[PDB]
Amino acid sequence: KFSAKRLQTTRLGNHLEDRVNKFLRRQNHPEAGEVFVRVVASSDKTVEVKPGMKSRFVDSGEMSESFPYRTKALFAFEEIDGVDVCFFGMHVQEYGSDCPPPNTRRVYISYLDSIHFFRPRCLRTAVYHEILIGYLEYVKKLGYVTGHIWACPPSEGDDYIFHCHPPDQKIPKPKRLQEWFKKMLDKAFAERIIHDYKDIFKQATEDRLTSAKELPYFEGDFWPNVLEESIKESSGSQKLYATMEKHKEVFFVIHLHAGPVINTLPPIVDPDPLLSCDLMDGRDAFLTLARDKHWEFSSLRRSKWSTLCMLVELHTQGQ
């Protein structure tokens, strides 16, 4: 059987799944089926400091030439009409306790995407928020300290993870998306999971940032390219602050631990093994496969069959 339930379980996936399904059992809605959360890819990578920042800070010995990270792809499936429907996907980057500064003990959400067929609709957002809260709660427990989110909707007609969204699935503008993250993080705060969250500009000020080399440097994040442009343009710190302030509302810095307890945390050890899966190594592979195979997520029926196809591929990549 090629169900989503039969995809390999992990501590991470199970923690998210248990959180979602406990939330759903506290709601009085008949329609809500059981949710499965599966980590489907997990591999170790490095992000290299791009040439401008490398010449300024790596060649002078002020900044590590690259940063190691674990990246993971996870997906959420709902039983709908007795048949799995993938409705949520997310990629994360995790910079562990051995990672050189400035990235040490930080997580970054590379990408998040969704297809709006969760039943019931009135619980869809709450379920997305619970998946994200669960993720923060989980990496906090392993000893990560700071999480990072860039609230950036896709360009028009573009897809982050799932090929071909429904035509009536509206795409939030950045303001709506910031507010969506604030509501999620406000709930995380109320549950005493996160200590605080701040926009990037306020955080940099309180951190007394004076050099671009102090900014966490993540793969595909906004800031590495900003820094490459400012070096081609040629007080780098004064510009950086002006850019951070200008876009501050869209960059979230989330603190999972605060205060002197940070100084006591043991090494971070991922209890889950790595999972080799070329299909879900980054976003382009699955997007390409679906485009070529005409797997769309644009109606419930097409999402059902595309989920079936995605599941058969994930179960047999290792055959």
Ligand X SMILES: CC(=O)N[C@H](CCCCNC(=O)CSCCNC(=O)CCNC(=O)[C@H](O)C(C)(C)COP(=O)(O)OP(=O)(O)OC[C@H]1O[C@@H](n2cnc3c(N)ncnc32)[C@H](O)[C@@H]1OP(=O)(O)O)C(N)=O
DSSP 193-236: S-SEEEEHHHHHHHTT--SGGGS---TT-HHHHHHHHHHHH--H
* Contact call for residue 125 and ligand X (CB under 6 A): yes
- Residue that the structure tokens 């997580």 belong to: 107
| Member of 11, 154, 183, 312 binding ligand X (CB under 6 A) | 154
H or E, element range at 108 = strand 106-114
- Binding residues among 266-305 for ligand X as defined by CB under 6 A: none
* Contact call for residue 124 and ligand X (CB under 6 A): yes
288/292 Cα distance (integer angstroms)? 6
185/193 Cα distance (integer angstroms)? 9
263/142 Cα distance (integer angstroms)? 14
Which of these ranges, 61-69, 172-180, 195-203, 206-214, lies near ligand X under the rule CB under 6 A? 172-180
* Contact call for residue 170 and ligand X (CB under 6 A): yes
- Number of C-beta neighbours around residue 31 at 10 A: 11
Using CB under 6 A as the binding criterion, the count of chain residues that bind ligand X stands at 24
CB of 81 to ligand X, least distance (A): 20
Pick 57 or 162: Cβ nearer ligand X: 162
Query: Percentages helix, strand, coil for the chain, rounded to the nearest 5?
Result: 40, 20, 40
* Contact call for residue 250 and ligand X (CB under 6 A): no
Print the binding letters for residues 173-202 with ligand X: x by CB under 6 A, - otherwise: x--xx--x----------------------
| Member of 152, 226, 231, 300 binding ligand X (CB under 6 A) | 152
* Contact call for residue 133 and ligand X (CB under 6 A): no
For Cα atoms 127, 132, 135, give the angle at the middle one, nearest 5 degrees.
Answer: 125
Q: Can you say which residues are annotated as belonging to the binding site for acetyl-CoA?
A: 112-114, 124-125, 171, 176, 180
Q: List residues near ligand X by CB under 6 A.
A: 109, 111-114, 116, 124-125, 128, 149-155, 160, 170-173, 176-177, 180
Q: Can you say which residues are annotated as belonging to the binding site?
A: 112-114, 124-125, 171, 176, 180
